[PDB]
């Protein structure tokens, strides 16, 4: 209360939130990716370099945020997984 900087009941579930949020983007991307080709026409055809630059640009930042999410949840999830468990038992050491 004194500081909402990070509530125990928050940072605790925070990780769990990252996981769900991680997968969310995992699928979301797959969801939008479908609209990419379906919207490709919006770029004036799907066989146009235009839509192409969008595809790569999509997958670009995509995997970028997807990976960052994984690597993030990889060290975050441990919050209530390892971090909580005990020191030295964090992914850092434990495979």
């Amino acid at each position: 209360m004194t500081e909402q900087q990070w509530n125990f009941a928050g940072i605790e579930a925070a990780a769990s939130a990252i996981q769900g949020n991680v997968t969310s983007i995992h699928s979301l991307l797959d969801e939008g990716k479908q609209s990419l080709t379906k919207l490709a026409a919006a770029w004036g055809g799907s066989g146009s370099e235009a839509y192409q630059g969008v595809q790569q640009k999509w997958d670009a930042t995509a995997t970028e945020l997807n990976n960052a999410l994984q690597n993030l949840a990889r060290t975050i999830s441990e919050a209530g997984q390892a971090m909580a468990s005990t020191e030295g038992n964090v992914t850092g050491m434990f495979a």
Partner: protein, 99 residues
């Protein structure tokens, strides 16, 4: 197949996309915020490991947020600005929409 780029099809895909973009952004923001609690609690390694992962992801969040809107708008520029324009029967109930 129904159409190629027909504003009808695009709108059909765009409208479905906007949701993905929004949600995607919603989830991203969720992490960006949630991570706040993480970076606010760590004990070496897990700290920089995460804190960093938060930086990379964060900086990437924007990158995505950009390609999200840009793409979400790319449809608008495609010529998709009239699809759900079915307010024909709107003013109808509207009249009976009050007391």
């Amino acid at each position: 197949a129904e159409m190629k780029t027909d504003a009808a099809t695009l709108a059909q895909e765009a409208g479905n996309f906007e949701r993905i973009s929004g949600d995607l952004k919603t989830q991203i923001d969720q992490v960006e915020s949630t991570a706040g609690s993480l970076q606010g609690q760590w004990r070496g390694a897990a700290g920089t490991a995460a804190q960093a992962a938060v930086v990379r992801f964060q900086e990437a969040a924007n990158k995505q947020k950009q390609e999200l809107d840009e793409i979400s708008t790319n449809i608008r520029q495609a010529g998709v600005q009239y699809s759900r324009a079915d307010e024909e029967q709107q003013q109808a109930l509207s009249s009976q929409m009050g007391f």
